[PDB]
Amino acid sequence: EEEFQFLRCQQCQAEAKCPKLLPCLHTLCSGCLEASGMQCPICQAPWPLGADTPAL
Ligand SMILES: [Zn+2]
Ligand SMILES: [Zn+2]
């Protein structure tokens, strides 16, 4: 309902490219997303560390 709201990518949405944790909508795509336009505070940091997400 909040934060978590995607599972593909910021711009290149094909098949979840960001395995980053999923509590802060960070399942976008490690390469073009960084709280720049998906719903996160300049996250760009804990990308490699994720909690309960799908990953790739
Ligand atoms: Zn992308
Ligand atoms: Zn985030």
Side-chain angles (χ1 to χ4, degrees):
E1 203 102 351
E2 298 262 13
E3 291 83 28
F4 167 44
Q5 196 199 26
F6 222 50
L7 45 145
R8 310 201 226 245
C9 140
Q10 181 221 50
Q11 243 280 260
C12 8
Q13 54 228 34
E15 206 187 295
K17 229 136 198 248
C18 161
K20 187 184 144 160
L21 37 78
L22 243 192
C24 72
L25 201 161
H26 244 103
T27 305
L28 290 316
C29 128
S30 200
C32 88
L33 190 277
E34 47 140 27
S36 264
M38 47 84 133
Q39 279 262 231
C40 264
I42 175 33
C43 262
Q44 216 246 72
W47 233 277
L49 236 173
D52 39 37
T53 101
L56 34 139

